[PDB]
Write a protein that binds this ligand. Sequence first.
Ligand SMILES: [Mg+2]
Lengths: 129, 55, 70, 318
Amino acid sequence: GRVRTKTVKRASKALIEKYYPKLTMDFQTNKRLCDEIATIQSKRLRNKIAGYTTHLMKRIQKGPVRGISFKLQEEERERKDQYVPDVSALDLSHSNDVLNVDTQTAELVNSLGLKLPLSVSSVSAVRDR
Amino acid sequence: ATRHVLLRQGVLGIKVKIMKDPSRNTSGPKALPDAVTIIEPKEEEPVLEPSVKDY
Amino acid sequence: HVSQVYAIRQAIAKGLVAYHQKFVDEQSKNELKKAFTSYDRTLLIADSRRPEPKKFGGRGARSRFQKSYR
Amino acid sequence: SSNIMLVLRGTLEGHNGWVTSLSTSAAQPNLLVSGSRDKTLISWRLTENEQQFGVPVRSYKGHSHIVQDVVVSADGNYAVSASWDKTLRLWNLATGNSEARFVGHTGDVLSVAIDANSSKIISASRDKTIRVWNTVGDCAYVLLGHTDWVTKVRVAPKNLVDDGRITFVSAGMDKIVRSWSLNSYRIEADFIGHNNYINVVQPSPDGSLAASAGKDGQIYVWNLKHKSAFMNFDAKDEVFALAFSPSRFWLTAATASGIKIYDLENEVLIDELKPEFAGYTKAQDPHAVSLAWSADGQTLFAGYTDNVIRVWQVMTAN
RNA sequence: UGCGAUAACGAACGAGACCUUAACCUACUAAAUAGGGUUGCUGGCACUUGCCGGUUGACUCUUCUUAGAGGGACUAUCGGU
Ligand SMILES: [Mg+2]
């Protein structure tokens, strides 16, 4: 049962939060970085932490994760959100014709506004569920 | 620290454990072996032109 | 005796390789290594296993004495 | 670009770890001494027969950790490695023996650089220091350069007639490349260009140009004799190594994806080098950590993570 | 033990970490209270130069020895699941 302990995991997470850059995939370097950074009394523990960090990095390299979304990750997300692949056109314009609204909908429109583009559907209630 | 105490009725057994703080221990390690305190990182400004500064 | 023999064998295996590394082509050494791997009865790799401590409550390490609740 | 299209000819396999550095001798062309993560250091010699472009001549078993950066002397009889066990080892390449074990660093020795006269060694470590050694085993000058790790230190060759001072540049994880001089025995200029962290600072065969690269994925070239700013390339992924060739104003650069190749002044991002691997999934594909051009400007050597020295060669289209 | 799902959030003890020992070090520091190499004298051989020895006679070494300081494994790299 090589389940890396909770404390270790936490430490790794913290490290990731702090220093996402200066954590290059490979292991020895990572370990060294960890040593430089945090005050691990043990050696074995430190090694474990390093390993965990490496694993996390690897995971990241195949897309993001839960509990690991610190700064750089946010920026990456954020940019995408800002400049979405969509939208060409409006979108959600009156691209094809002038809105296939229902009879009821049309009535509502009439009640409310004056002159709108409409295409009045038949409203088939339809049999069965 | 264990210490028996003789009284009229019988004996009372006193035991005392005092967990000294790691910082004021001096001999041996100054911190617990499981605790991993991570130092806070330091900020830097990227780019600001290629530039040089000669002597 | 057997253990001693094994040790001797291991030493022999090492020695030639070492010599090759030192004073002969590396290719030869590599070949030797490959050969050893192919017929690996340890030889270059030192054997990992040392005996277990015979902890109390038992005549061997893992083995215990003999309970009875009769 | 014009004519040459580089072709993978040979593949050298004598290691069991990352081939973290290679170095052809300045005088002698046939040699290629390759340093690795698996503690060994292997001297290859160019045969030029079938797939076996080179075959191993001598292994230098004498370190308790990684062998990071190797240098060959000008003549090509001695070589100095820089290991992760806080030392360097001056070898006798032809003999198959050590000579000088350099003690002093309090951190894994990342880079080494010998003078063109094969006299004054200088080395940098994960120690916030660069130490200067002789061809014996003795610490002369000690440079308190940076506040973070010093990743690379490489001496620039000079021709225009004898000032006295020899010049090198020290890459770091402080985001500062820093040039030096050694007979003022001190600083030349700070090249504060990088955004992320630097891995490599490679001076060219010319000497006046110095390509710096790292995690940023942007290769900043620097003018050294003029002591001024110059070009800045974008290379997408993290750069592990750089290499100038004598043949042209080529800048080879080992990215995380593969090996990109540019022309220096006429900035065009020309060729990419990527060999094949068995199986694998997505964003892993064994990358070139180090690489080295020969003295001809013909045979490109590439140290990979997959324990192979991959050998590319010039081949004209027409 | 974690990952997850979650009127629960972050914690402590216990487990883990820890310690001792068992494993690796032709990389360091060391030794006639640990072991070898050359050589002196010297025993026997074949009798060419070579083979085994015995002597704390010299000189030098640290691989095995010990045992100090360190590294070294983190499930590492790759494949699936
Ligand atoms: Mg896997």
